[PDB]
Amino acid sequence: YVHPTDILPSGWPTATDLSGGAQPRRFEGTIFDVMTRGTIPKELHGTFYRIMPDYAQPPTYYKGGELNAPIDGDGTVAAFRFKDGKVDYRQRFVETDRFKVERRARKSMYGLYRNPYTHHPCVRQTVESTANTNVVMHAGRFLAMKENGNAYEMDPHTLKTLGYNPFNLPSKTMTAHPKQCSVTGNLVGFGYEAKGLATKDVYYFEVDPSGKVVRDLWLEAPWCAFIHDCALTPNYLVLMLWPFEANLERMKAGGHHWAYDYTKPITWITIPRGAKSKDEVKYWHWKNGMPIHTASGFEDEQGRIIIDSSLVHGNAFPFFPPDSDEQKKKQEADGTPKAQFVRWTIDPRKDNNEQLPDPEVILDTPSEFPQIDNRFMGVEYSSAFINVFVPDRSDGNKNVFQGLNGLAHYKRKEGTTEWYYAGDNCLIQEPVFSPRSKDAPEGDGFVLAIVDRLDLNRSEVVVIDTRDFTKAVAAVQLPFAIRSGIHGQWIPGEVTPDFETKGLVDLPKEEHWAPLSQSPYDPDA
Ligand SMILES: [Fe+2]
């Protein structure tokens, strides 16, 4: 049986998200008092903000959208606010300059990921960011980020877009993976391609809790590399270079911004915090592979930089293949690479020209989207909350972003790993952590994540108490599915302006519309 209306043509190209799912959602609005199952912990007082790529218009401008990437689509923020056991939800697109152009024209006007030579001529000199990868609340300001532009600011309650580049960074870009230092409170980050397309320039900065840039430095990467993420330590910001290179000639010819290169080693740039000269920066190298995200970093008792990350032993973004014929044939032959969670040691006393030691395998399972207890951000940390392919219950042949059906709570100090299974016919997305109280022990509290109930065409938020990581205490049940996203963050109400007085949904007025005389009821009858 085929439903006759299902053979009527659609004008939509296949617009995937990182999970591989391709259903456009695109709604903007609210649900007040979202249905829950179980008991919402009274200790949750804040908002889980998650951001997702969800092209608002069918992305047909270049090559009919055939080469759209899962990381391309217009950023939309979902907010789930927990207060006193009750949850509200709001979904809204970021009003990026790109989104505004395309909605006003009711037309796709942009081409390939990060390639202005494939956008419509009238928009080539716009900010092309879709602000779709991560969010942060810093200095009272709520930001949507994507690494090919500065951030867009949004109201944290209505999600209305307020402006661009709120911290007035001088670079053309800001990472979507800045880190909020637990010691200083600074937002510590960088922007690469910081002087425009295919530039090697990197701008490092720290923005203090009042919104002021208090430390910065201009430097360069060894090649124009895809510097997605970083790790913060007490004395360093360490940039993590993936083995992709940008080529302006390729982009002018209409090809992809990035191409994977098997000959590039994973490379790290150490930036001493508050450095005064680019001469203080050092480049360190291992071997080829793709460490997608850091959990965090710290310095050990001997001052050595320790960083945990995912590690895919090959290209986890196969939609940006190599440039050369020989390397393309290797990618196709290899298919899905081995994927693990690992630990790197960079000893600053060593000669940085010597190859780094091989990383230690921490989890021998495909692992991605790690987060930590941010009370330990930029210092020694132990807990990591990791999105995993659950051992013996997962499909190792899926790309790392497409088979994530569990969570792990890894504790370095104890050496233990606990496991949460999302369920049969379920995926689960990146976890976030909220401490049980401000002075709870590290990693004691609640873990939240979005679950795709694939057989039900719905999405839910699960809530897990770390005292039993294997069991959900509550589920927030939406009446529909949302896109599978990239990152999200738990943002405590304490740091959210006006959290005490403003909900995600504004209340209707108190006064009745109708006069007293219209009631059916008479107290005398
Ligand atoms: Fe990321």
UniProtKB/TrEMBL annotation:
Its cofactor is Fe(2+). Keywords: Iron, Metal-binding, Oxidoreductase. InterPro entries: Carotenoid_Oase. The keyword Iron applies. Fe(2+) binds at H177, H228, H293, H487. Fe cation binds at H177, H228, H293, H487. Binds 1 Fe(2+) ion per subunit. Pfam families: RPE65. GO terms for biological process: carotene catabolic process. GO terms for molecular function: carotenoid dioxygenase activity; metal ion binding. Belongs to the carotenoid oxygenase family. PANTHER family: BETA-CAROTENE DIOXYGENASE (PTHR10543), CAROTENOID 9,10(9',10')-CLEAVAGE DIOXYGENASE 1 (PTHR10543:SF89). This is Lignostilbene dioxygenase. It comes from Moesziomyces aphidis (Pseudozyma aphidis). The lineage of its organism: Eukaryota, Fungi, Dikarya, Basidiomycota, Ustilaginomycotina.
